[PDB]
Each structure stands twice: as structure tokens, then as C-alpha cells.
Amino acid sequence: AASGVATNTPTANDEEYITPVTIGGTTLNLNFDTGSADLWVFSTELPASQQSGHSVYNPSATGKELSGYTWSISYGDGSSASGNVFTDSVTVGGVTAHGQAVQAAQQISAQFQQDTNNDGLLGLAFSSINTVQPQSQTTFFDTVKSSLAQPLFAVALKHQQPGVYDFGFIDSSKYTGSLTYTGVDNSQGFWSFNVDSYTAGSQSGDGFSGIADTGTTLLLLDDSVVSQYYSQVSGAQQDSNAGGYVFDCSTNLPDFSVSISGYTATVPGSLINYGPSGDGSTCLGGIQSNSGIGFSIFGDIFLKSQYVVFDSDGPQLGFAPQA
């Protein structure tokens, strides 16, 4: 049976986490995203000026092209990418997927052309939302799941420290106590779960649902919740230059917690200070609006406080405080 550990590393301010992946012999730094199901990479099919600053995949060398297949993806932050498809060997933390579909970029939006920290994304959401056409393909995880010791992956994302992606096994030294599991609704292709209630510093409220997304930087919640939270932060104000609520970096922030199947997952106020807003001497809050979409995005801000198990049996998600 297989299992492996891939090490992730946060970029500046923990904006994103990158992990090396070897494709057909070439190592690329990818952003592992539990919010999507496409494995796409910068390739030699891109204009030479866009290959700059990146490690790129050369399909010609080792991939097998899927004639007539294309892919096109759009993310929540408005970025997008599109291209063609090849099958190749993909290795993550010593676990190799043979014949994995690799989406070679032909076009990338400005956000991607501006970010030299990654060379593409590896999606870990359910394969049901993979964008390959005419026939969708399976994610790296779905491709290898049957060969793992256990059909799950686990993640420990840290604040300005290397973290891990455990594939096929749980590392009990990564958390305190025992894990608590909750059921997942994969109907929209996400690792979606329910919270029974929340505590925002001195205020508590009713439950809601959200997705566990390693690919989103912040904790995105309903506007009501956001308001409630910053109403308790002396001098907090919205700053469009920064992207949301900002405050004095020295401010004492309240904790934020959610009740999940009887387990209280708490994000300490210190992790809610994202970092410099880069607009003077204010810091950006880790909690921001979800734009009225109807469900919350449990992004990296949240994940830095827990060890999370993504289990395909159920499916279910397990949580415990990071050790």
C-alpha cells in the first residue's frame, strides 16, 4: 500500500501554500487546492514571455495527448486558465499516479501571469467538478486513492513554517487529542460541512455551511458575521485599497470558533491578523465577506489552526487542534 508526505511552504504572509510535484521528470511548484478539481500547469504552449519566472511542463517530451480534449477554469477571485490535455506520470510525496490527466495551460489570466510563486494548481475537490471536456478526468487523489493504505489525505498548514500534506495515512503527532468527524455533502463537488453555531468574540449566532478550501487565503463569511466580528475591533474600517476590513496591527483580536458535530474549532485572534494591509500601518483582517454567496469558505486562516482529514469514506472531514 502507498502513503507519502508532501511538504508545503507558505508564500509571503501565507497568501498561498506551494508543494513540489514531479510531472514526467520535471518538478513544478504547485498550489494544492481542495476547492477545485483540475491539475493544470504552466507549459511550453504558453507565450515565451509568460513562461518566464516559472518551471514549465513540456508535453511533447513525455505526455500522451488526448486528441480533442480541452479544459477551461474560472476561480472565485476572477482568475482563469485554459488549454489542452495530456496524460503523464505525476508524483507527489513519493506517491505516483500513472496516466494522470495533466492540463497544459495555453492561456492564463493576468493574476496568474503576475504570480511567480506557483507553476499551476493541483485540485483536490471531488472529480465531479473537473473541467476537462468532453469527458472529465479524475483528480490526482482519485487516481491513486485505491492504491493508498487509507483513501484519505490530511493537511497541516502553518503560519510562516513548512507544513505537510499526508497522503493515505494520518499522522497523530500533528494534532492534540482525538479527531472529530463530520459528514460531507459532496453534491456541488466541494468538501462541504455544517457548523451548528459560531462564536465571534463576545457574540454567538446560528449555524451555516461552508467548504474546507486550502486554495482560499482567508476565512470568508456572511456579511452579518463579518460586521459582528469587526464591531468588536476598536478602529476597524473597510479599506478597498487593502481588500476589506483593516485595523491597527497592534490590536487585540477576538477569537472565532465554530461548533462542528460537538467539537469546537477555535481560530485564535492572533491568526486572524493576516499581516500588513500594505496601505500604511494597518493590517488586513483574516475574516472578510463571502460576497453574499450563501455558504462560507473555510480558507487558510481557519486551516492554520487545525489538522484536517479529508476522507473519501463517507465522505467525511476530521478535525483536531494542530499540535
Partner: peptide, 4 residues
């Protein structure tokens, strides 16, 4: 930050 991003939203992916």
C-alpha cells in the same frame, strides 16, 4: 489573497 486568492479565492480558488
Amino acid at each position: 489573497x486568492v479565492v480558488x
